[PDB]
Structures are given as structure tokens and as C-alpha cells.
Amino acid sequence: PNLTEISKKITDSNAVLLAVKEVEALLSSIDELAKAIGKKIKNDGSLGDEANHNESLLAGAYTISTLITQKLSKLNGEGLKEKIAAAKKCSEEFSTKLKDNHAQLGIQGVTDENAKKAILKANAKDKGVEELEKLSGSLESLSKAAKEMLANSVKELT
Amino acid sequence: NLTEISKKITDSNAVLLAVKEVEALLSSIDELAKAIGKKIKNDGSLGDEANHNESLLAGAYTISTLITQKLSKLEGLKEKIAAAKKCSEEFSTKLKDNHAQLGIQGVTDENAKKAILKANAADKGVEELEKLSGSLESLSKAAKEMLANSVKELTSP
Ligand SMILES: [Cl-]
Ligand SMILES: [Cl-]
Ligand SMILES: [Cl-]
């Protein structure tokens, strides 16, 4: 086993995987935001109902979406190139769908129903959530491939 | 001894990944803070729609409790994980304790920024957010050092 070269493959694969994990976590944060649709912080630490004031919550989801795109615009690794480009495209289609639906998602008093169509995966139509789901799938594929590359480099140490 | 070093690399990678996930959740709160008082515009910019921040803050709060849960699930890092976990609880509790300004209809931009906008020159949570950020940076640095040092062992003679 050429330990110098295996060392470099491990380092590079870890660096890709770290960047992918950061993007996956940012996607997870949008799922958390979706739990706050139509909600407020109560004194008892629960979320209480306060329907139909979701505009700045959705602006937060949008800002996170553009950060995801910026990370994917810079990230690279052989057989990851296509998966990264695909994820970057999906991330742009998500942001574009939100912007295109500004007349429902970017007004005073954005309704719970419209916010759910943008970012709540459990929503049953699409104002962004289908693009969010495709983005999640694209990142899962990228993660699986990045993890397999790291696992293969570590295995060469036998 | 490559079997022992491989284990150290895979375990250190796994810890580092878990730490980076938490740091990225904290990053998302910093991005939420950019949306205080804002709405999505047709041209892709954020436009002003002031003083409707309660559900945005409920989102930050939800993320903050997830941070604590992930830290609860995490060698050589015990003290730094415990510090980060405590800081994360203190941030969530500060938000909840400020419900009278952060959990009402029409939360103002000013009060939202005192909760989650770092370096806000105008405390309703930001100081706790900043302490949490520093505690996760210290944990991240330690986890990175443990991975880097394990990898460096591979080529030692
Ligand atoms: Cl559309
Ligand atoms: Cl974990
Ligand atoms: Cl008030």
C-alpha cells in the first residue's frame, strides 16, 4: 500500500464529504423551518399557533437556499462531478421556484398553506417543495458516492 | 500499525462530520438573521417587510433545539462537547425566556436582531448565539486536529 498516496486520497475524500455534509445540514435546517410555519415561541418553550405571517420565515429559507447553491458552485471532487452539477442545478430550481411564486410567498401575510407548498415535505400544488425534495435526493446520491470513495480509500490500508 | 490507525481515522472522520453538521445548523441561523424584516422579491433579492419576525424566530428556535439534540449524541472531546451542549441549551432558553418580545404578533426587526443577529450593535439571545458559535469552533478545531494527526501517522517511519 502506497501510504503517502492513500493518505492524500483519504484527506481529499474527507474534505469533499465534509462539504457535502454541510450542505445536507443546511437542507435539514429548511425542514426545521417548515415546522415553524404558522408558529410562534411560547413562554412554556413550545411552538404556539399564529397562522399566516410566514413571509420572513420563507425569506430565511430562500437565503439558506442561495447559500447551498454557493457551496455547490465551488465544490468539486472523477465520478462526483456529474452529481455535484446535478445538485447545483436542483438547488437553483428550488430558489427559482420560490422567487417565481413571490405573489404568494413574498407578501405581507404569507399563509400557512402557501408556505407549506414551498417548504413542508409532508405537504400533499408545488410552490417549491417538490424542488426541495429533488434537491434532497440529489444530495443523498452525492453523499452516498462521497462516502463510498472515502470508505474505499480507508480500506486500501487493509 | 495500520489497523489501529485506520480505526482512528474512521472514528475521527465520523466525529468531525457530526460536529460539522452542528456548525452548519448554526450557520443556517446566521442566514435566517439576514432575512429579519424581509420578504422574497421577484428579482431574487430580499425586500423590506418590517416587523413580522415571529415565525422566523420560531424557526431559529426549532433549529436551536436540534443543535442540542445532535450534541447530546456525541474521546478527547468530552469537555468541549459538554461546553457546547450547555451553550446550546442557554441559547434556546434565552429565546424562550424572551417570548414577550420574540413570540408575539408582529415581532419587530430590532428585537429579532437582538436575538439572532451576531455583532448587533443595538441582549435577547445574540450573546448566547455567539458563545455557542465559539464553543463549536473550538470543538471543530479539536476534531479536525484529531483527524489530521491520525492521518499524519500513516506515513511515519
Ligand atoms: Cl411557478
Ligand atoms: Cl452522531
Ligand atoms: Cl410588543
Residue numbers in the entry:
A (entry chain A): 40 to 116, 118 to 164, 167 to 200
B (entry chain B): 41 to 114, 118 to 165, 168 to 202
Paper text:
Outer surface protein C (OspC) plays a pivotal role in mediating tick-to-host transmission and infectivity of the Lyme disease spirochete, Borreliella burgdorferi. OspC is a helical-rich homodimer that interacts with tick salivary proteins, as well as components of the mammalian immune system. OspC consists of four long α-helices, two shorter α-helices (4 and 5), and two short antiparallel β-strands located between α1 and α2 (23, 24). The biologically functional molecule is a dimer (with monomers referred to here as OspC-OspC′) that assumes a knob-shaped structure anchored via an N-terminal lipidated moiety in the spirochete’s outer membrane.
